[PDB]
């Protein structure tokens, strides 16, 4: 929680996530990667953990590529570039995840101060009315299985 | 079969390249022929007796597949073999005739 | 499966209409099917054996 | 049974069946197959499971 507070206001402070040593594509790092995927803000992830999270939902519903075919994309792009590139595929007319989002937000209670004030971004993918924030599209729906090496 | 191009994320100080796998799986798990997956004769099978005819060849194909549930089980293990060993040693000649 | 419209006598406030059946019968214990009422096939079912 | 008769009101609930295969087939799925064509109306499944 400190250090999601934290991420929603340096603006060069976005969290870095540290993956587990030694295994790859174990059955509970893509429910986690799911997890983050659509409940985690987009804001306040690096671009290397953003793109390293698309990678790996992007690795079973891919029909050719596989997860390291996948990863061998560092080059010929950069980081950012190609998490815009997966999320466009994930967004089409035959996949649609939500990507949870966030924005702005400057609402304050007038009290005398003697410094300046600022507006942070809401480590909360809710928006002010309740209705949820998603990237590009909500109501998931998908016309194939998530089909990874062997899960 | 087919080649393999995955890895593992591990520090290591070689480079890694792609093998065959030891079964005929695909990354699906469904079985990889060569020709066609049809088994159909014209005639039986003979050689000095011993016939064997054209419906028991069907039958013994049909109960060689793979369990198609051991797939995830039957990768990992080729996935941290091929992420291990010196891509530079797989032209190295065999020495010990009984090893093969 | 076809529609039934029958409808039984209570006292209610609000119309009702036509729902399918859940199973094939069409009122006779003779079922119903779309195109023929037989099973001639030129073959054999075969599909990497069985 | 709950859920057929559910089905055969709304023309929007069709019943999706969920199958235990991936690319394999089995003999006990192709037996049931046959059943569900020959038994099961069309007009309570929805269009992938037909």
């Given at each position: 929680?400190?250090?999601?507070?934290?991420?929603?206001?340096?603006?060069?402070?976005?969290?870095?996530?540290?993956?587990?040593?030694?295994?790859?594509?174990?059955?509970?790092?893509?429910?986690?990667?799911?997890?983050?995927?659509?409940?985690?803000?987009?804001?306040?992830?690096?671009?290397?953990?953003?793109?390293?999270?698309?990678?790996?939902?992007?690795?079973?519903?891919?029909?050719?590529?596989?997860?390291?075919?996948?990863?061998?994309?560092?080059?010929?792009?950069?980081?950012?570039?190609?998490?815009?590139?997966?999320?466009?595929?994930?967004?089409?007319?035959?996949?649609?995840?939500?990507?949870?989002?966030?924005?702005?937000?400057?609402?304050?209670?007038?009290?005398?101060?003697?410094?300046?004030?600022?507006?942070?971004?809401?480590?909360?993918?809710?928006?002010?009315?309740?209705?949820?924030?998603?990237?590009?599209?909500?109501?998931?729906?998908?016309?194939?299985?998530?089909?990874?090496?062997?899960? | 079969?087919?080649?393999?191009?995955?890895?593992?994320?591990?520090?290591?100080?070689?480079?890694?390249?792609?093998?065959?796998?030891?079964?005929p799986?695909?990354?699906?798990?469904s079985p990889v022929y060569?020709?066609?997956?049809?088994?159909?004769?014209?005639?039986?099978?003979?050689?000095?007796?011993?016939?064997?005819?054209?419906?028991?060849?069907?039958?013994?194909?049909?109960?060689?597949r793979i369990?198609?549930?051991?797939?995830?089980?039957?990768?990992?293990?080729?996935?941290?073999?091929?992420?291990?060993?010196?891509?530079?040693?797989?032209?190295?000649?065999?020495?010990?005739?009984?090893?093969?």
């Amino acid at each position: 929680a400190i250090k999601m507070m934290q991420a929603a206001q340096l603006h060069r402070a976005s969290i870095e996530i540290a993956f587990p040593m030694n295994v790859s594509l174990s059955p509970e790092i893509i429910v986690q990667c799911f997890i983050v995927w659509m409940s985690i803000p987009e804001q306040l992830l690096s671009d290397r953990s953003n793109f390293i999270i698309a990678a790996v939902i992007w690795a079973g519903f891919s029909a050719d590529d596989s997860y390291a075919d996948i990863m061998r994309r560092s080059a010929r792009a950069s980081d950012r570039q190609n998490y815009d590139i997966i999320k466009a595929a994930l967004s089409s007319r035959k996949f649609k995840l939500p990507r949870a989002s966030t924005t702005l937000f400057d609402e304050n209670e007038p009290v005398v101060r003697r410094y300046q004030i600022g507006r942070v971004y809401a480590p909360f993918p809710v928006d002010r009315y309740g209705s949820p924030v998603y990237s590009n599209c909500t109501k998931v729906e998908l016309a194939s299985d998530y089909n990874a090496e062997g899960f | 079969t087919t080649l393999f191009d995955e890895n593992e994320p591990v520090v290591r100080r070689y480079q890694i390249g792609r093998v065959y796998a030891p079964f005929p799986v695909d990354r699906y798990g469904s079985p990889v022929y060569s020709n066609c997956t049809k088994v159909e004769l014209a005639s039986d099978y003979n050689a000095e007796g011993f016939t064997i005819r054209k419906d028991d060849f069907r039958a013994l194909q049909a109960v060689l597949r793979i369990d198609e549930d051991r797939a995830a089980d039957m990768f990992t293990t080729l996935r941290i073999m091929i992420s291990s060993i010196p891509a530079v040693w797989y032209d190295a000649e065999v020495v010990h005739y009984p090893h093969t």
